[PDB]
Structure formats: structure tokens, C-alpha cells
Amino acid sequence: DRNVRYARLAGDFAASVKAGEESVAQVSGVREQAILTQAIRSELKTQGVLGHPEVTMTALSPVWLDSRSRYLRDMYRPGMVMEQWNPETRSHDRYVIDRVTAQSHSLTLRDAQGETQVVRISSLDSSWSLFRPEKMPVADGERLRVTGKIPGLRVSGGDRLQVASVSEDAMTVVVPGRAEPASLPVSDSPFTALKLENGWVETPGHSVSDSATVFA
Ligand SMILES: [Mg+2]
Ligand SMILES: [Mg+2]
Ligand SMILES: [Mg+2]
Ligand SMILES: [Mg+2]
């Protein structure tokens, strides 16, 4: 049974993290990634590795677009976030999708000030990026995966951060090759949300096998 098998995987995975040993958890799909992640966090709390209190925050996960998909209307859903790279300002301008209009193949975008504009799905090109805002729980000791540049940090997509402490007001993280812990915001809006996701389980797609597996 799955809940039984995942409980035992979590027990092995947590015991190895507690000992400071290298350990990796893989699964074959995003649903299993969420379920095994819940089982692993429960067990890391029971084994003393992750704090019991948790803080929820909005965070962003990339939705991949390329020349074949970028102009397909249903790739866009109300409440996703889009960013456009600004060549002057060297800055990503951020919006929320309020509306996707069929007939006219148009998005209505709203900015942090609450200003809107209509963009033709047509003018998008590779200067735009799409994200899903997700709410996620974070506790003291969390392992996070970086999914994009984080304001104020030198980290990149694919880096790992370890959460040293988290509260309603700030999350402090240990940054590989940075001396001091860095303080980051605890977001409750798509406009302040950081490009992070939980990092205990690997992203699926290029795994050793289809079965949920702990390498410990
Ligand atoms: Mg904050
Ligand atoms: Mg945050
Ligand atoms: Mg965030
Ligand atoms: Mg960020």
C-alpha cells in the first residue's frame, strides 16, 4: 500500500538527513512528489530535524513555455503570474493574469499598483515568463530549491537553501558560499513571492526508475 511504503521511505530518508549523510528522494510524477514530500516533512519533525511550527508563504514555480506552446491560449490561466524582462532598468516587471479572452486571444494583466493593460497573446516572445503562485509551509530546518533569481542573493535556479529560522516576519537562510545567514521576506502576495519551492524530493522526469525511491 502507498501510504505504508511512503511512511517507510520517509523514515529512511529522515534518519539519513539527521545523520548528516547524503540522501536523495525520487518519484515519477508531481502528485507523488507532493505526497512523499508530506510524509518526509512529518517524519523529519518526529525525528527532530525540522521544527514543528510552520509558516505559510506564497512562492512561485516556473511553467515552461517555448516557441511551440507560447501562443496557445489555455497555457494561460487567471491568477498565474507573468514577468516581462525590461532591457532598461535590467528588471523583471511582474503581473497577475486577471483575464484570458478567447475571442480576441488576449490577456488582461494587473500590476502591483493595480494598473491593468491588455496584451495580445501574439506579442509574447521569449522576454516573458509564466509562474504558478503556490502556498507552501516552511519550518525551521527546511530544505528549499531555488527556481529563479532571488532579490539580494547571488543564487540561481537549481541551488539549495537551508532555512535556519522562520517566523511570520522573515525567513533566514544559509546560502552556500555566503558567510552570514541572509534574511528573506515571508510573502503573502504573488507580487512579493520568491522563486522557491520545497527541496526535499527531486523534481520528476529523468529518474533512476518509476518507483518512489530513497537513496540513503
Ligand atoms: Mg516579510
Ligand atoms: Mg516568502
Ligand atoms: Mg516566497
Ligand atoms: Mg525570487
Author numbering: 575 to 790
What do the paper's sentences say?
In the paradigm F and related R1 plasmid systems the 192 kDA protein TraI is the substrate of the T4SS encoded by the tra genes (Everett and Willetts, 1980; Reygers et al., 1991; Lang et al., 2010; Dostal et al., 2011). This bifunctional protein includes both the relaxase activity and a helicase that assists unwinding of the T-strand. These regions of TraI, called translocation signals (TS) A (530–816) and B (1255–1564), target the relaxosome to the secretion machinery (Lang et al., 2010). In this study we report the crystal structure of the TSA domain of the TraI protein from the R1 plasmid.
Analysis of the protein crystals on an SDS-PAGE indicated that, in fact, an even smaller fragment had crystallized, TSAcryst: N-terminal sequencing of the crystallized fragment showed the fragment to start at residue 570. No attempt was made to characterize the C-terminal sequence of the crystallized fragment. A model was built between residues 575 and 786. Domain 2B is made of sequences inserted within domain 2A, while domain 2B-like is made of sequences inserted within domain 2B. A structural homology search using the DALI server was performed which resulted in the identification of domain 2 of SF1B helicases as TSA's closest structural homologue: the RecD subunit of the RecBCD helicase ranked first with a Z-score of 8.9 (a highly significant score), followed by other SF1B helicase structures. Thus the 2B-like domain of TraI constitutes a previously uncharacterized addition to the helicase fold, which here serves as a signal recognition surface linked to substrate transport.
